[PDB]
Amino acid sequence: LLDAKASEFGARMTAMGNATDNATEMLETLTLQFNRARQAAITQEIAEIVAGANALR
Amino acid sequence: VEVGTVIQVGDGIARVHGLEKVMAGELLEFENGVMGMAQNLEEDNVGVVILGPYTEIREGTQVKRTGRIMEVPVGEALLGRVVNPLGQPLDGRGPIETAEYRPIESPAPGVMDRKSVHEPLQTGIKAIDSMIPIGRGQRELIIGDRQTGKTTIAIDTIINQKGQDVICIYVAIGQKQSTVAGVVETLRQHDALDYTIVVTASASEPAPLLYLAPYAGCAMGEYFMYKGKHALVVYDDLSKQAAAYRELSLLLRRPPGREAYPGDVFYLHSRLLERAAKLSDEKGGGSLTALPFIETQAGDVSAYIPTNVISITDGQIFLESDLFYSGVRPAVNVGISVSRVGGAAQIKAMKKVAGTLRLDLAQYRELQAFDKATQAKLNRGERTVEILKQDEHKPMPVEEQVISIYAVTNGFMDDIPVEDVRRFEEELLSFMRANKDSLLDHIRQTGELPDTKELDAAIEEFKKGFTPS
Amino acid sequence: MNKGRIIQVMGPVVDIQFESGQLPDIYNAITIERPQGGTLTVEAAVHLGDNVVRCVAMASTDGLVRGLEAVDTGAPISVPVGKATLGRVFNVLGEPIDEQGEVNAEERHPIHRPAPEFEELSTADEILETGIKVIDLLAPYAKGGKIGLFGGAGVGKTVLIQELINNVAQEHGGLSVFAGVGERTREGNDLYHEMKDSGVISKTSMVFGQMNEPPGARLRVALTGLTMAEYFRDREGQDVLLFIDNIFRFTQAGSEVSALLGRMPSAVGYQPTLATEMGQLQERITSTKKGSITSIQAIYVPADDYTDPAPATTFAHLDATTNLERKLAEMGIYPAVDPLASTSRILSPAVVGEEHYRVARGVQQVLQRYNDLQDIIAILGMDELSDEDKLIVARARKIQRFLSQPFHVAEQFTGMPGKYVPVKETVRGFKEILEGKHDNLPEEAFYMVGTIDEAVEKAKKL
Amino acid sequence: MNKGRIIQVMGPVVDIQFESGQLPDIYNAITIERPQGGTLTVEAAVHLGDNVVRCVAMASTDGLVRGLEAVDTGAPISVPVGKATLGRVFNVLGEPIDEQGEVNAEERHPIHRPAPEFEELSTADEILETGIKVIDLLAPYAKGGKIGLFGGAGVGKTVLIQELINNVAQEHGGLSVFAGVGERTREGNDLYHEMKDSGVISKTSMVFGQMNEPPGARLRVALTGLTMAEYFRDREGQDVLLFIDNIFRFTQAGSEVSALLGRMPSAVGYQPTLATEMGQLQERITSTKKGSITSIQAIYVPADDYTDPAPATTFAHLDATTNLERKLAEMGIYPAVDPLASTSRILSPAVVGEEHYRVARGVQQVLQRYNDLQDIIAILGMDELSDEDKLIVARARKIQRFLSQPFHVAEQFTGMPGKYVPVKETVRGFKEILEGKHDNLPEEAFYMVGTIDEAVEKAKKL
Amino acid sequence: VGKTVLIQELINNVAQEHGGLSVFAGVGERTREGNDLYHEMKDSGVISKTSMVFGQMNEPPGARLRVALTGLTMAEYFRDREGQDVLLFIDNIFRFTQAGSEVSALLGRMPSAVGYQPTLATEMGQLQERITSTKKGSITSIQAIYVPADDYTDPAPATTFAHLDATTNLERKLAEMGIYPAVDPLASTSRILSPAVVGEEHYRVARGVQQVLQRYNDLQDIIAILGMDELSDEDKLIVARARKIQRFLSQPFHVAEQFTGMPGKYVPVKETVRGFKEILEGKHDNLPEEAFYMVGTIDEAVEKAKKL
Ligand SMILES: Nc1ncnc2c1ncn2[C@@H]1O[C@H](COP(=O)(O)OP(=O)(O)O)[C@@H](O)[C@H]1O
Ligand SMILES: Nc1ncnc2c1ncn2[C@@H]1O[C@H](COP(=O)(O)OP(=O)(O)O)[C@@H](O)[C@H]1O
Ligand SMILES: Nc1ncnc2c1ncn2[C@@H]1O[C@H](COP(=O)(O)OP(=O)(O)O)[C@@H](O)[C@H]1O
Ligand SMILES: Nc1ncnc2c1ncn2[C@@H]1O[C@H](COP(=O)(O)OP(=O)(O)O)[C@@H](O)[C@H]1O
Ligand SMILES: [Mg+2]
Numbered sequence A: 001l002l003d004a005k006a007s008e009f010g011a012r013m014t015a016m017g018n019a020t021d022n023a024t025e026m027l028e029t030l031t032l033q034f035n036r037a038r039q040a041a042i043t044q045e046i047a048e049i050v051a052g053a054n055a056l057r
Numbered sequence B: 001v002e003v004g005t006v007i008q009v010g011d012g013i014a015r016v017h018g019l020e021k022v023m024a025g026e027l028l029e030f031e032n033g034v035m036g037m038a039q040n041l042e043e044d045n046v047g048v049v050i051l052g053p054y055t056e057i058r059e060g061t062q063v064k065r066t067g068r069i070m071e072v073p074v075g076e077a078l079l080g081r082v083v084n085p086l087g088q089p090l091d092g093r094g095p096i097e098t099a100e101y102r103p104i105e106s107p108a109p110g111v112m113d114r115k116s117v118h119e120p121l122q123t124g125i126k127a128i129d130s131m132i133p134i135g136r137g138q139r140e141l142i143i144g145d146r147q148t149g150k151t152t153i154a155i156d157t158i159i160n161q162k163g164q165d166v167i168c169i170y171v172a173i174g175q176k177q178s179t180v181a182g183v184v185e186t187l188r189q190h191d192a193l194d195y196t197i198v199v200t201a202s203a204s205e206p207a208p209l210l211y212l213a214p215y216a217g218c219a220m221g222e223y224f225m226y227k228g229k230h231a232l233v234v235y236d237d238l239s240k241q242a243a244a245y246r247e248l249s250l251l252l253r254r255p256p257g258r259e260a261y262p263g264d265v266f267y268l269h270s271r272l273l274e275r276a277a278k279l280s281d282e283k284g285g286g287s288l289t290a291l292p293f294i295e296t297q298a299g300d301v302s303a304y305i306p307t308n309v310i311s312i313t314d315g316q317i318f319l320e321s322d323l324f325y326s327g328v329r330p331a332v333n334v335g336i337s338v339s340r341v342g343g344a345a346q347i348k349a350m351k352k353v354a355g356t357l358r359l360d361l362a363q364y365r366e367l368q369a370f371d372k373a374t375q376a377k378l379n380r381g382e383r384t385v386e387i388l389k390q391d392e393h394k395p396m397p398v399e400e401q402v403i404s405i406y407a408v409t410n411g412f413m414d415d416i417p418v419e420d421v422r423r424f425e426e427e428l429l430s431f432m433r434a435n436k437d438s439l440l441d442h443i444r445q446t447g448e449l450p451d452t453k454e455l456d457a458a459i460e461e462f463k464k465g466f467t468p469s
Numbered sequence C, D: 001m002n003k004g005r006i007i008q009v010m011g012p013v014v015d016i017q018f019e020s021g022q023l024p025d026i027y028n029a030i031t032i033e034r035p036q037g038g039t040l041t042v043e044a045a046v047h048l049g050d051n052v053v054r055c056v057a058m059a060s061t062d063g064l065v066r067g068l069e070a071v072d073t074g075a076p077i078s079v080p081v082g083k084a085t086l087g088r089v090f091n092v093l094g095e096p097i098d099e100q101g102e103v104n105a106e107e108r109h110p111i112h113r114p115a116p117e118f119e120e121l122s123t124a125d126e127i128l129e130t131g132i133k134v135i136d137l138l139a140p141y142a143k144g145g146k147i148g149l150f151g152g153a154g155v156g157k158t159v160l161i162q163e164l165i166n167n168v169a170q171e172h173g174g175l176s177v178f179a180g181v182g183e184r185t186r187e188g189n190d191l192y193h194e195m196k197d198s199g200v201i202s203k204t205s206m207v208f209g210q211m212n213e214p215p216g217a218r219l220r221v222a223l224t225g226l227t228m229a230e231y232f233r234d235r236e237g238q239d240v241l242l243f244i245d246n247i248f249r250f251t252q253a254g255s256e257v258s259a260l261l262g263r264m265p266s267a268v269g270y271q272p273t274l275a276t277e278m279g280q281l282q283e284r285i286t287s288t289k290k291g292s293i294t295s296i297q298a299i300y301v302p303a304d305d306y307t308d309p310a311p312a313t314t315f316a317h318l319d320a321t322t323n324l325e326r327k328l329a330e331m332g333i334y335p336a337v338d339p340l341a342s343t344s345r346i347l348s349p350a351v352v353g354e355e356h357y358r359v360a361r362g363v364q365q366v367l368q369r370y371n372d373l374q375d376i377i378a379i380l381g382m383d384e385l386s387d388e389d390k391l392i393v394a395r396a397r398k399i400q401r402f403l404s405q406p407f408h409v410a411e412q413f414t415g416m417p418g419k420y421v422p423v424k425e426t427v428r429g430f431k432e433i434l435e436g437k438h439d440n441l442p443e444e445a446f447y448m449v450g451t452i453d454e455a456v457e458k459a460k461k462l
Numbered sequence E: 001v002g003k004t005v006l007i008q009e010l011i012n013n014v015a016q017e018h019g020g021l022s023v024f025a026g027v028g029e030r031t032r033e034g035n036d037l038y039h040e041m042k043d044s045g046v047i048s049k050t051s052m053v054f055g056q057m058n059e060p061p062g063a064r065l066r067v068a069l070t071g072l073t074m075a076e077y078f079r080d081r082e083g084q085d086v087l088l089f090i091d092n093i094f095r096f097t098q099a100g101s102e103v104s105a106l107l108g109r110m111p112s113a114v115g116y117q118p119t120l121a122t123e124m125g126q127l128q129e130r131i132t133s134t135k136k137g138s139i140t141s142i143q144a145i146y147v148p149a150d151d152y153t154d155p156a157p158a159t160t161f162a163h164l165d166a167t168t169n170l171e172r173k174l175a176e177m178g179i180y181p182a183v184d185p186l187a188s189t190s191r192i193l194s195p196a197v198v199g200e201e202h203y204r205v206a207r208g209v210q211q212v213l214q215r216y217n218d219l220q221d222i223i224a225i226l227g228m229d230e231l232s233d234e235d236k237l238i239v240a241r242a243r244k245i246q247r248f249l250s251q252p253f254h255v256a257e258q259f260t261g262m263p264g265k266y267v268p269v270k271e272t273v274r275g276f277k278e279i280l281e282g283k284h285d286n287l288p289e290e291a292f293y294m295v296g297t298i299d300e301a302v303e304k305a306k307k308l
């Protein structure tokens, strides 16, 4: 039982160590997507304002 | 002379009255010697983009026709010289004395004018020459983040053309002038400058000169292509050119789109790289090889400008950041890098030895992020990685590359430790150059691999003398 | 022949002043003799007023001067049609670019015309076997229908359309037409010699207006090839194959001219006339009562964004869609076809049969659940999944690999010889996988093979 | 010289009409006498037509009236240079703001000029020895290089700046310039007094473009400081330091000016001249044959996004980064430079020697290993670590303390006198620790000393 | 999400037994709903107390721009001149701002952020500040406020927040579950939520509900990946009670019988406070979740659990 418990907790270290490394990989991918959308949103918003102003003049 | 007068000017863009008989895209000269480009011919006026400093140009300033379509000087007068996009010398070694000129804008070779790429352009870099081989007339994108080894691939490729009768053109667009000065000094030390033309439009230079720089370098390469010779052009980089063209387009109030770029931003690069080609026997058989650069942000190959240039070129060499900052240089990403020409751009020996080398390493890196059978592939993989590592400014002859790759792939370094593989390679080639020179010379002359049994004995003969850690 | 004078030159746009009463119509070809020699053809677009016509140039406008003479031809750009175009290579103006002498063609048809009438139209309700497993199973093409190959940069559009030329057009009774629109000139040179060796060239008319060319040429070059295909359809009653690589470049070239025409931009900087221009081109590409056109069009997706106006508006003009995806390409899954995003109008029991339909939707149900579990699988792997999902994931990964296939055109890259899989074998293979008949076999056995028998054979030496 | 009339006043923009054939050049300073005393300076930006010049104001436009006389100075904003600038505080126009009397310089140079010519430039990278162990070893500065300074509030940013001024002046004889781009007036007052107390005031000229000044003033203030730095390079051959805090506020000012002039914005709302403006500033900071200007630049990163156009364009010019960490300052490790996060382009066998690179990488590998084991040590304990790791942990703790250093400027804080440590001594000291020569010495011996000999000398006293 | 259904229920509950007068302003909304409300007010007898004004989404922008002022002027009379309490119902006030946005560019005005007019705040304030109680009379104003794209950061609803003493913040995610009225229990706010007005017990129970629901939201993203059984016994009990509290916050409306398929319920305040107090104390932990869903009092939840 004690040896099986040692194997259980060791297996949980590895599995949750991988899940931590996988989470950091995904967190970077999401941060790239966010900053892609943030930059695209500001580019579009300001372009529509300037386009609207040029239509009057 | 036929004169005009500036009526409005701002941000290097002028409106000129007069110049009645001026052509569209004509070279113009202002009072103070600064050059200009007649972009738009309007009903009563002319739109002029200033191709230089504009702090002495104003309303009332006069400008004259040259009678010439936008052009640059070309030929052997530019060899070993540093110039701007107009062909004016920056090195301070006197003027460019030449009678030959070629236009900035020029049509690409037609459908019947070309031939399929079948001649090697050896970079001298093991990772590239084996896995992503470049041919004469090919367009191969070099793409990757800031400080991932892009310029070093181009300079080492240029250095490797010494004694190969290939003219080189290094076009610097939007780079620091420090680095271009360093590049020309590196070429001087390796005796690569005397067959190389350096076109430079630095980051302090106004945007229209960054815009024109690749086309000026292309024209200089084209001269040699259409006369039967072979040339290599490097655009370092097209991200600076694209951004410079966006500035010009936004100053002209042209409608912006994706990432604020104009609708003809793909056409900016597509007409540039179409002019790089391999001509037919009827047209002299010459070629122009293109190595355009794109600098990604955070490794994002799916962005607008990167996907434009991937859509133009004949494959690409992606440089991985994580590999580059963990010992692996050059940091070639085997998974997404590819050469469309492939085996046709390699000699017979290199093709046979490194036939499946890219997919074997792609499989290795997949298995690394994860038994006895797969354990042997990991051990073989680590050793092949050490062979493809290479110091900067040290090109390797193709006969030496194929021997080095032959040894590691057939298992002559499995009993040797991983840390000794780089030294094993270096000492094996010293043994091969000094003693067994006939095996190397067979590859040089024919292009084919030597006798299998004779080469295996020569490697095993060296292994007796070698001593591991 | 009525004369005119150049007033303005603005990139690919040229304004020309004509005398009162002699004003050229919209879409009329106008020739201008250059000061450097040669002729520049120009196409009338807008009537500005004061007898001035704003036009779009079909070639470079560098070297032009204000006041030069312009000659109205009295009609649109007109190009050769019929048997004389077969085995020949053309440009936007219908001039030969193959250096095989003159094209002795009787008639010259105008590249601009209205779409066919409603009563002329003919619906495509019959499967066209490609021999490619993902297409034939999940999103099959229709005979005389409209097919679209969507994809980002370097995902495999040209490799796919070349494979469809190899599989479909070689053993085709009728005629063929290829249109190079804004792509690599090298690939046109490759495809010419590729078709010349195989002998398919003699029943193929080719037209090229590639990425080297100015935007006016890239805008109208598809209409040149289309007019030749329309003649074979209507006049000769032929079964025509129309290949276009890449139709996005026609829309892209439209945005370039639209900027210097002075029109106000729409969403993402595109021309306001994006949908109308696309419809006026696309609606002519269709089957009629007299004859059929089976069109296969490569469609570029800017920055891998399918919601971009260009590919988004293209979806309306298609019976079947092959949606290529970079993620599958980077995994080694070729062809990189998204099995859920790719759709077809003829995937129904009436056309493909009950078994085909049931197996197709069964595959998509497995893959849909696998797609839903990706966020969990990315973090925790397959350890916390239920016994039911573990089986679904295991079958999904095998399905995903059996959907891949080695191509005849991709022999040069991979090294594996290409495979042609019949529809019956494709339906049988994925049926057996759904029934758990090959649960014992490892995953790599399903990767890059033809039939399910080849997967059984591959598993032995593995 | 040229004289004009104010026709419009619209916020910080002023349109001035001049007489025909006698207009100011672009970037020329134009002085306007205020009705209620004083002088407004404006900078010529655009030539609109009808002899009208649009100008960007360097101070407030309130109180101005249409029709007032505006005098063209005939050149750009010209500012004093040489030893008269040392120990003084300036504005964008080169006028003293310290109330410390007259500035008797011999020459005044224009702030607008081209970058150095190709023939003038240095052709190889050379280290600039700061005398600071952590910087010189792990992230060395290059002559003519640009360094990104990162760090929170109260971590030793101002103390590090003052020490670099002191060390370069003491050992290399190179003077300094501080350019406060968007300086907070409270903090400018503090920095002036802090530099007086440390004594580095006499080696530095200060230029503030304060937060409450117009966008034109904050845009050009870096060029004023740059021009003062250029004199000492070009005339006296010095390796000069140029501090710019904050470089983002220079870009921000350009965007604000661009909006006032009515230009179409670029991506993420930035000015279309983003790269041009940054490049024209940055390229002037370089190594010539006569001397160099090395620049330490504080950089704000919008939304913590390094792909944003402002930092992305700035990072194109950077040669190194000095990353200050708060956790090191809390431990007492000053200077609090992060030895793993700080990087340099010139850390290689080409620029520095083979030994320097070997030792620097060895230090990094040891400190990285110690950083990875922090979670394992905290929970499991030291007995969990292998015999190899125990030694690595011991050496890493010694290495981390030997990276600290007593500063000449920080004698008040630490108590001990300051130390300048040469590169050769730094390389030798960390080499000997990695080889295991000083394993038996206590950890306090390595803390707050200069050379490795001073650590051995400290060990007997403990 | 449920603005019109909510305001119609507030008319049914508050305006039915109201001693004073009322005004309804239909501003840029569905004409069907104006006909529905008119005939509903005619049947109940509330029409005699109520002045109605309509300028609906069929109308041009100018009509939608000024129709709220027409209704407001009638309400202002009943406040100032006559000595009687007024209820002012507006559905939907956003349409005033949108109507101004439609005409803005044609009036010659350069656009502001998110396609809106530059005079958004000034035009809103000059209308909104008239809608108020004074020393002369009392106006209880209830205004439906459209949130475009479910985006509360949008300039129109963002600017509107300054003009309110209480806010009922509807969210789609609650409506997507079937929780009606889909009221955000955290983001909804009131100036009179304090011990001085509602008493010490009311404030403590209300705050207790918010802390339990806040903790449930913090655990939702953790539970979704890592699972339910990895939590502590305290957190498992918090999750169980939060879901029951969230369902007891739902309620069947008198005006929404055709959508709910059951009779509407009125619940007194002292009864409401008692119900949620007993759930926090743990007296209904053995009742299933569906028992708390769509009921009036806590007694009805005990009766509903027997059916399940
Ligand atoms: N194979 C290599 N071995 C060692 N150092 C290299 C190698 N390739 C590049 N470097 C170095 O790495 C740095 C980045 O290379 P560089 O070509 O400048 O990248 P980029 O042009 O993409 O910024 C340079 O300092 C260069 O000297
Ligand atoms: N079916 C396939 N099998 C193997 N590789 C492929 C396949 N399709 C594409 N590729 C790879 O992708 C590259 C680009 O293909 P291509 O058709 O040119 O893409 P696109 O036309 O979409 O830009 C090819 O050179 C090849 O390396
Ligand atoms: N080299 C150093 N040695 C000892 N203490 C230091 C050192 N640098 C900074 N400090 C401590 O940190 C405080 C803040 O330093 P300062 O340079 O003003 O930080 P910042 O400019 O980032 O606000 C100082 O008052 C001092 O006590
Ligand atoms: N209290 C409620 N009970 C049951 N269903 C509701 C309730 N509120 C809204 N709904 C459902 O949502 C629909 C939309 O409600 P409505 O008030 O018209 O939304 P809006 O917020 O757009 O005015 C209703 O027709 C009904 O089906
Ligand atoms: Mg570089």
Ligand SMILES: [Mg+2]
Binding pocket: C157, C158, C183
């Ligand atoms: Mg393609």
Ligand SMILES: [Mg+2]
Binding pocket: E003, E004, E029
């Ligand atoms: Mg409603």
